[PDB]
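Quick illustration for those who missed Monday's session on complexes.
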Amino acid sequence: GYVGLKNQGATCYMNSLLQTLFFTNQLRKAVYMMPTEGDDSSKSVPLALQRVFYELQHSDKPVGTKKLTKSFGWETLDSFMQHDVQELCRVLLDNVENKMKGTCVEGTIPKLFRGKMVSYIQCKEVDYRSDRREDYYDIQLSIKGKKNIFESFVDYVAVEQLDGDNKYDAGEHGLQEAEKGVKFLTLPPVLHLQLMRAMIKINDRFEFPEQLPLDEFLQKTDPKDPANYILHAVLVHSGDNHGGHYVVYLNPKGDGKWCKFDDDVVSRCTKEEAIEHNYGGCTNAYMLVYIRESKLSEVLQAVTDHDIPQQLVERLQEEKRIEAQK
Ligand SMILES: Cn1ccc2c(=O)n(CC3(O)CCN(C(=O)[C@@H]4CCN(Cc5ncc(-c6ccncc6)s5)C[C@H]4c4ccccc4)CC3)cnc21
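Prediction with A1ICO bound:
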């Protein structure tokens, strides 16, 4: 069936994030096209990602991630405990964005994960506005006092007020009252939403749907292409600071057919096990991946063994062979 990653020490969320990344087929195919031919076998993160992806594609056995851990140098537990899950992701996708530059596959990472945003400060009684367009690769939703994703987005674009003890330094116009907000211009083909359960681990109930309509949070909607999001992955944690375990649910083909990825054990599971059971109320979601309905089949284009350049094949084929140890 689908194949697992080893629990080889204390990689925490790493295995779950790799598998979500693996099953973002278009990212995978792009990764395979990177030119690692001349990359140092053990310093190179790009090479490491291709190997893991290759193995996840071909291996009958649980897949090892040691060279990967080494390649970006989070060899300890503190590494993972010092960092957020989106920061791991940036380290991996940052290195692959870079390696793809000057190649056919340049810009695939932005193409898949990059959206844009406007942040503004508007003065009540003075004609003065500060607009800042930012990119984003992922979103950090508040959950405390929020029942669902919907309420979270609502809170996200909430218009804060800057008043009295907290007025805005509007510069030439002196301290002024204003309202600062955020708003979405694009939403990317792949939406990575992290749920801010840390503060610890808040176990409060937080609901999320299979289908997520986001048109109503954009500025301009497109009747051609609506912002409807198909739930792809659920990154899950359970436990506390003494003992905790990380796991991920995927329906890799976006067709409602879920599997549970528990390191080296991958198993069929129910929609209920993947979704409602991870609302919390202790084992609950901390990151969810959505894909835009309209890009579903592009992102999740099917992948063959022929999509992997021979040059790369041999290199790994060979590498394995040398394993030969008494
Ligand atoms: C920007 N922002 C704000 C909040 C927030 C946020 O929650 N997320 C999500 C997140 O990134 C996912 C990945 N994370 C983890 O897996 C956490 C790792 C640390 N855990 C505590 C310790 N347990 C043993 C510790 C320990 C200490 C000393 N020696 C040995 C062991 S320290 C809790 C784990 C955790 C799991 C699930 C949910 C929340 C938190 C971090 C959070 C993302 N961005 C956010």
